[PDB]
Amino acid sequence: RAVRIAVFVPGFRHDSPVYAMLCDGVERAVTQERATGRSIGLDIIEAGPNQALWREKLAHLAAEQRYRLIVSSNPALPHVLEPILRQFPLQRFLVLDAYAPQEHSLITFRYNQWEQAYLAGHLSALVSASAMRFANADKKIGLIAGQSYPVMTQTIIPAFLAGARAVDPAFEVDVRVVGNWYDAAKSADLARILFHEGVDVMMPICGGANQGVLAAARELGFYVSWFDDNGYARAPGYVVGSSVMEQERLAYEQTLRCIRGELPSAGAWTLGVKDGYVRFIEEDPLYLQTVPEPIRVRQSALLRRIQSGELTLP
Numbered sequence: 001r002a003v004r005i006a007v008f009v010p011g012f013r014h015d016s017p018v019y020a021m022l023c024d025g026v027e028r029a030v031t032q033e034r035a036t037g038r039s040i041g042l043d044i045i046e047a048g049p050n051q052a053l054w055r056e057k058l059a060h061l062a063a064e065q066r067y068r069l070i071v072s073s074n075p076a077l078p079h080v081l082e083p084i085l086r087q088f089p090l091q092r093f094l095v096l097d098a099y100a101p102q103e104h105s106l107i108t109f110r111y112n113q114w115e116q117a118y119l120a121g122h123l124s125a126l127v128s129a130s131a132m133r134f135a136n137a138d139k140k141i142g143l144i145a146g147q148s149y150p151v152m153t154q155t156i157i158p159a160f161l162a163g164a165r166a167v168d169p170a171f172e173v174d175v176r177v178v179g180n181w182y183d184a185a186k187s188a189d190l191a192r193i194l195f196h197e198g199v200d201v202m203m204p205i206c207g208g209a210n211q212g213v214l215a216a217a218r219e220l221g222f223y224v225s226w227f228d229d230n231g232y233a234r235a236p237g238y239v240v241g242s243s244v245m246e247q248e249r250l251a252y253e254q255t256l257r258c259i260r261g262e263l264p265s266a267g268a269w270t271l272g273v274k275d276g277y278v279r280f281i282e283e284d285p286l287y288l289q290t291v292p293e294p295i296r297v298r299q300s301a302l303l304r305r306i307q308s309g310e311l312t313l314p
């Protein structure tokens, strides 16, 4: 039996870790199963930045009645989908990085981003408190978000702060917002503001604008806590951590289940460190070269406490 899949990207694929990972994993599954001789179609729709059009674009994909599954990502998608689920109940949807319990035609997976961001904040504070080249004597770290949204304000920011405060309760996090997920010039401006306020380690979570923060790091001399995927090679020596979600693998795994007829129609899963889907990347040689022993030792010890449940971050 032939199978057709659509991926709805709420923005652009390139330069957005969550969407690049999503598309890479769906493609990997499709390519794999095509190679067995099976006919599998894959269409990727890049919606672009205009969020006011997302709902109608998704409704048209459902109305086309051709996709066995429409795949998307990000925590706003369940809300976007609400009337579409009602109007087109036979259309199956899969959304990663989201949470929608108790739907009938929508299955979601959320990562434990308290773990993810706590790992990032702890690493950031260790670096900021150290005598590394660009560290200063303040206890100030930064976060530059593309936009504000409930997961960012209720999970990521508080967990980043909590991880930092586990190192020293005096740590502060200065949050800034770009207003979009692409403009690297505008994120660089925020990074310069943070640097001059005394921030020596920043975490960019602003999509294609992340590059602006990397540029500012090289320009001014500060460190970057990278999120979502492996960012060490994007600015060797500046990127001091990668605190990640295993979105490429999850997208691959769930797409395969769809193709083989094993993906449930509904459900809302949460996957974290103990499940293997949130990680701090210690194995990259750039990390080992970039970050001194005492910091790496403490970061490893933290990972062990999360892996055992001793430190549970629900």
Ligand SMILES: Cc1cc2nc3c(=O)[nH]c(=O)nc-3n(C[C@H](O)[C@H](O)[C@H](O)CO)c2cc1C
Binding pocket: 010, 011, 012, 015, 016, 017, 018, 019, 073, 074, 075, 076, 097, 146, 149, 151, 181, 205, 206, 207, 208, 227, 228
């Ligand atoms: C409405 C909305 C739009 C988003 N757009 C992007 C994006 O274009 N690029 C990106 O890298 N992350 C984007 N994210 C963030 C992403 O889903 C995730 O929360 C962060 O990458 C941290 O894991 C978006 C989040 C929301 C809620």
Ligand SMILES: [K+]
Binding pocket: 149, 150, 153, 154
């Ligand atoms: K909020």
Ligand code: NA
Binding pocket: 127, 128, 129, 135, 136, 137, 138, 139, 140, 200
């Ligand atoms: Na510091």
Ligand code: NA
Binding pocket: 128, 129, 130, 131, 135, 136, 137, 138
């Ligand atoms: Na210091």
